[PDB]
């Protein structure tokens, strides 16, 4: 199981940052750089049916080790790094046998601190890989790419029985295009896992049901000095709508399993205004309830307006909670959990307050929970990872593949 | 008193529309076209000390008719037409002996209607001048320019005693630059009147005290799924501020002498938001009270925010109510009122729910109330005027000049 570190740093050195609002997929050339590198490494490795689509999705198959009717399983990672910070000229910082202090990031006033991140006191003794403080690290999701790549080297070069293993590396996960052009048919996996989770132990199979609620408000402007009973202030309606939305059921005041309404943005004048709301909820019923609530709030404020003044709502479903799709087949989480115990890891299962490409794929015919990576503080300069956590991800992937063949 | 109509139509044919947010004054070439025309006509008329500044303000003096120590008075009109509708290729429509029906504007579905404008039933018998329905008319303020120009022809060509009469024609009244570069010193008028009012009888000397209140809100954005006790939604603060502003004390619900708060515009995201409020009030005390109220409302919402999240208010005074400046010298309104009675007109004195260049000049050393013009429905395609009302404006101006010399 060597070259884990090497593969990781190699991938980290490549600028693969994604770009919002681009029509082309992948959105940036850098991503094609890493995809081509992976493609070559897969060929050299000896995988079969390797293919890189025009949309930049890399697929490949490691054939069964043994005979028997074993279901093919898959592992998926995404190639791009967050637009929220640069993954440009990352300069990794390796801290062997971390003793628990503050980590200086590069030369300057930048620090990885256990005061700010208590998790560190949970990683005494390990090798930490950090940034110089001037960029992202890319652990998300290049540690996953490295771990999958590594798990394949281990499966191919050791006496470990396994069925067919499908792997994929996708392009614009960060900008929401991760599963858009995913050819589940070509992939040919009975089920899969994304290796795009957090710390050691993380296993996720529950995510938010999501929807956007756009509101278009048309008022009536006129010179203010003579607006009596004539002027319809659109912003006054916007404020009245938001006044009715539960301030206790908002991102700033929810945690764990509680849903919410959130006003992302709003802009307007007396004549027109627009609001962009989002609704998140683990429960499909309370998700519906949440749409109703908004429409209801709207009606209220839309009391009696001179039929040239209205309030329109446009509700768009973004994604659903996989729970149902995953739990529907017990072996998926059972194998993953048994695999972690076999590797002396305590499975930690927290719900995802957001979504994942796995949740999209789970509705496209590929139930697909999330596996940990060992990385932390995902989108900023405080992002870091530990080699041991990365080696455990490898161990788990390899065990899951062995266990799957065992039962097949 | 001829060429009133002719001068009017001539001026109406010139595109003199102003333009918002231009640094140059006048903001448009068309205005210089009318200013040059007026300049020439003043020369031909025989006025003295005629001058056109680099900023496009035209001044001129008609010397005293008689001797005695008579105070010089002035008459002011503005040359540009509203940006709110085109004053491009105006095609006037003349309706002699209006009998009270609906007036068809040009060829098409456009109408001047007494149902929509009850004033018409107050103008039976008169000659109406309307638009074709495709533009503004320009009565505001080209009727005033014509009336002043005409009043001067009458004063110069008839046995009517008068002291010195100063006249001025200003450039960007519509875009707020009307009195900016007004050289009151060069003008040399003890007091003046703007001929920029409405229907026959109108005399205005009270206007709003005005101020803008800008609010900058800095919040704290973070991915929503993990914003608990961390995310500070700036829009939520904006809505909470506007929630505290009196919906009964707003443009849509005030009239006559009642002040108000008005939210002109607002834009924002979770990280930042901005609000542009205006405050209008005839009373200087309640104007102050209104500033206090806003600052107060702000404090409340600014409760306890992590010192990286704040709410800043920036209050800018725009203009004041002239009342004080005008009433301070009784002859100004006394002469104007006596003049209207001498002309068999009932003086109508309503407060201006907004401001005028006269109110700005009144604080620059030139008390300056507003005189009627006979025009109605100022900024749209439904703008119209009546020749009789225009002739009365002329009569009043001429009488005011005669009365002023009488008492001097
Ligand atoms: Zn991410
Ligand atoms: Zn990721
Ligand atoms: Zn106007
Ligand atoms: Zn005007």
From Swiss-Prot, chains A, B:
Region entry Catalytic C-terminal, spans: 319-408
Chain positions covered by the region annotation Catalytic N-terminal: 1-207
GO cellular component terms attached to this protein's record: cytosol
Keywords for the protein's UniProt record, in alphabetical order: Aminopeptidase, Cytoplasm, Hydrolase, Metal-binding, Metalloprotease, Protease, Zinc
PROSITE patterns for this protein: ARGE_DAPE_CPG2_1, ARGE_DAPE_CPG2_2
Binding site for Zn(2+) 1: 78, 140, 196
Gene Ontology terms, MF aspect: metallopeptidase activity; tripeptide aminopeptidase activity; zinc ion binding
Keyword check for Cytoplasm: yes
Pfam families named among the record's database cross-references: M20_dimer, Peptidase_M20
Chief place of localization: cytoplasm
GO biological process assignments: peptide catabolic process; proteolysis
Activity control: Inhibited by EDTA.
Cofactor note: Binds 2 Zn(2+) ions per subunit.
Binding site for Zn(2+) 2: 140, 174, 379
Keyword Metal-binding included in the entry's annotation: yes
Subcellular location: Cytoplasm
Catalytic activity: Release of the N-terminal residue from a tripeptide
Region Dimerization, annotated ranges: 208-318
Enzyme Commission number(s): 3.4.11.4
NCBIfam families: peptidase-T, PRK05469.1, PRK13381.1
Subunit structure: Homodimer.
Family per record: Belongs to the peptidase M20B family.
Summary of the function given for this chain in its UniProt record: Cleaves the N-terminal amino acid of tripeptides. Hydrolyzes tripeptides containing N-terminal methionine, leucine, or phenylalanine. Displays little or no activity against dipeptides, N-blocked or C-blocked tripeptides, and tetrapeptides.
Identification of the protein by name: Peptidase T
Gene: pepT
